[PDB]
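To close the chapter, one final illustration. This time we ask the reader to focus less on the individual chains and more on the assembly as a whole: which components sit near each other, and how the overall shape emerges from the parts.
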Amino acid sequence: QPEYRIYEMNKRLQSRTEDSDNLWWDAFATEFFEDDATLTLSFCLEDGPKRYTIGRTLIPRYFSTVFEGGVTDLYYILKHSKESYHNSSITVDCDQCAMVTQHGKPMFTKVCTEGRLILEFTFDDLMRIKTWHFTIRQYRELVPRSILAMHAQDPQVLDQLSKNIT
Amino acid sequence: QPEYRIYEMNKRLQSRTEDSDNLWWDAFATEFFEDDATLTLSFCLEDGPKRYTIGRTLIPRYFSTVFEGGVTDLYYILKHSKESSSITVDCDQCAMVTQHGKPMFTKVCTEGRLILEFTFDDLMRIKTWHFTIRQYRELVPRSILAMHAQDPQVLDQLSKNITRM
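The assembled structure is written out below.
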């Protein structure tokens, strides 16, 4: 099933530590992407639709640089996807795809990048992704929000202030 | 694999429509939980460890009441889970996520340690749900551009309130 393939992809990405070499991202791609795969991000903007497509060579470096900012976690949520055979492949067309990233210091902001992801799989034993096309339709940066009043009196926060003046 | 069963539970949760009648939750719990089952919440607080358990009878009413606050989406993320007539999945990094709507649109991340026991049947339903709530975050959507504060729509939200003074 192509569905699982993402859950697999998702879970394989949770496997990434802060030491992961360029060889690991290569293995990642060789696991999930065809030797000919292409990944495109589409924005339908004012001046007209802008597309950025990258080749198999930079697909591993693309996922590698998604984590660069001290990011801790990247995963994808597919809601109400569509399966169908088209262009001699299995295709999943999900209108509600959430590309999620998790950040660290200082904001710990969670970024939800949503739109229409259109994935093309081969009908192999491997079932790797031939085409990744993501049409970014929304964008959110969620901020953790102070929950209690006495949190503003934390010595640790006041310590950070002192430390900057030093 | 027991792991899929949650991805299934999750994928089924996106199916909850805005009406989802009490029968709909009846089927849900009957799909994933044994006719026996327990759902437990653990809080390790000052006065000591605090627990809340509900029986198979209340399992649907619990998940049904999870959505009540205008919540739109419920899902669980298992990170680095560990598996081992009882399969147990012991996930130390379990994130229960709910999505809220008007007016704050906050994403709630309730994280902790989830311990699930599944039967060795073809169906593989949950006998024991055990969740130890250890972190909690309320994420807020954040206005990204300056001019968003000058939107006529936000100013209209103001005007619309003054009319019902």
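The interface with chain A takes residues 3-4, 7, 11, 14, 73, 75, 77, 79-80, 106-107, 109, 136-142, 144 of chain B (CB under 8 Å). Residues 2-163 of chain B form a domain with the Nuclear Transport Factor 2; Chain: A, fold (CATH 3.10.450.50). With these observations in hand, you are ready for the problems at the end of the chapter.
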